[PDB]
Ligand binder design. Structure first.
Ligand code: HEM
Length: 441
């Protein structure tokens, strides 16, 4: 009835406990010790971290709780503005952009993005085909080049050409710098300059596109042509800019993390790699994968969901109570009280997944309808769930399928998993060697 709480440090309350490079991983250990709910205080602030499916299912009831803008999201809003990710559900622009963009992110819409995804995926595979025998792959680095360039191409038909450079395109440098600064706040001169670099490029492309009248298969065309069904209003140019920034900010790192963790688990589990590779060989019979082929990569899809189970790459989200309510029959909350969903702990709930939760077993996802509601939430919840979920999974399934078709992989360093935390998670320093199977591409 009384909620556990970890060590306090006087006026600093619990804050010193997150004085670490790996706060989510620290929080998982606190959850291991304290159980399914604990209080966590800082000077300004109180939240309650939830870890069990029993309480998280209640937290996911949208009549009772809505998305909160956590401090991290408030700092990100300095450059992501009122784009979808950093808006309250009640802001007019959240609803407008959500209504306009939702069908442009459906599974069906992936058919329209597929050619541009393949363009970047082929660039990645060709890079690896072109390595000499003495060389190796920097996995999260190459995965981030791929996802950034894919979201730039599908997002606004802009080529960052990340596979042509050691130093990233200057927009990328400013975006990555801007993100780091917002996370570190949890400089100012550089922050403003980096914001300006982002707005300038994105505003220019928007202005260029409106001028030429060109129609493309990208999200920018959808946003220039879209009208909110409720009001009949379009998004204005400022908000369109924030959405483009948001697709890059929200999408690039979580998706490259997922591809990196999935390859990690595959090289650490050779039997699973071989089963995934046999499927990729059977299904991807053409030098350029089709949309329909990617959809037949069922076990690759299971591999990706099981990677998201263990290390969901956007690991926590924040909610507030809409009205006074009692959580789990035991914990009274007041209107506005905050909850944090700790997704890696949720995904380790032994009452749902059985005792073997640390084991990498894609077969858990063989029958998606036996996973209970709200047991598996790597893309968040309800109407504030990831709008990019189909995009991320189509991209990851395509790319992983191709990697497994085209190369054998060696964990040549016997890499020890080290999870770096930013807004997202990734296996820092993960490296492999890939030997080409010499299959046409
Ligand atoms: C595997 C990769 C990804 C993961 C694990 C992921 C995860 C998430 C999660 C957990 C949220 C909810 C945030 C919260 O409740 O505060 C979210 C929201 C969002 N994501 Fe993703 N994401 C991924 C990829 C992407 C991609 C590629 C894009 C864009 C193309 C994207 C765009 C967005 C947007 C715009 C939102 C806000 C949606 C709204 O609230 O209306 N994400 N994502």
């Amino acid at each position: 009835k009384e909620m556990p709480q970890p060590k306090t440090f006087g006026e600093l309350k619990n804050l010193p406990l997150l004085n670490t490079d790996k706060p989510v991983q620290a929080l998982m250990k606190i959850a291991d010790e304290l159980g399914e709910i604990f209080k966590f205080e800082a000077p300004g602030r109180v939240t309650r971290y939830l870890s069990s499916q029993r309480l998280i299912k209640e937290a996911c009831d949208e009549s009772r709780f809505d998305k909160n803008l956590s401090q991290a999201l408030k700092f990100v809003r300095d450059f992501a503005g009122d784009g979808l990710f950093t808006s309250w559900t009640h802001e007019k622009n959240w609803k407008k952009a959500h209504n306009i963009l939702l069908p442009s992110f459906s599974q069906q819409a992936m058919k329209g993005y597929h050619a541009m995804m393949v363009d970047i995926a082929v660039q990645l595979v060709q890079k690896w085909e072109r390595l000499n025998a003495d060389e190796h792959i920097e996995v999260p680095e190459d995965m981030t080049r791929l996802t950034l360039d894919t979201i730039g191409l599908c997002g606004f038909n802009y080529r960052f050409n990340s596979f042509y450079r050691d130093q990233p395109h200057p927009f990328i440098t400013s975006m990555v710098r801007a993100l780091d600064e917002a996370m570190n706040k949890l400089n100012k001169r550089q922050f403003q300059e980096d914001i300006k670099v982002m707005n300038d490029l994105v505003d220019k492309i928007i202005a260029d596109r409106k001028a030429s009248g060109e129609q493309s298969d990208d999200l920018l065309t959808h946003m220039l042509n879209g009208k909110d069904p409720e009001t009949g209003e379009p998004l204005d140019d400022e908000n369109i800019r924030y959405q483009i920034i948001t697709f890059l900010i929200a999408g690039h790192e979580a998706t490259s993390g997922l591809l990196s963790f999935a390859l990690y688990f595959l090289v650490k589990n050779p039997h699973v790699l071989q089963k995934a590779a046999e499927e990729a060989a059977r299904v991807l019979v053409d030098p350029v994968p089709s949309y329909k082929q990617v959809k037949q990569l069922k076990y690759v899809g299971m591999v990706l969901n099981e990677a998201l189970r263990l290390w969901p790459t956007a690991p926590a989200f924040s909610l507030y109570a809409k009205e006074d309510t009692v959580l789990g029959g035991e914990y009274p909350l007041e209107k506005g009280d905050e909850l944090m969903v700790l997704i890696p702990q949720l995904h380790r709930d032994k009452t749902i997944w059985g005792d073997d939760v640390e084991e990498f077993r894609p077969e858990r996802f063989e029958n998606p309808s036996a996973i209970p509601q709200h047991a598996f939430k790597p893309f968040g919840n309800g109407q504030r769930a990831c709008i990019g979920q189909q995009f991320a999974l189509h991209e990851a399934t395509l790319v992983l399928g191709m990697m497994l078709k085209h190369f054998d992989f060696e964990d040549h360093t016997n890499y020890e998993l080290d999870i770096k935390e930013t807004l997202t998670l990734k296996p820092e320093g993960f490296v492999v060697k890939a030997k080409s199977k010499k299959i046409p591409l």
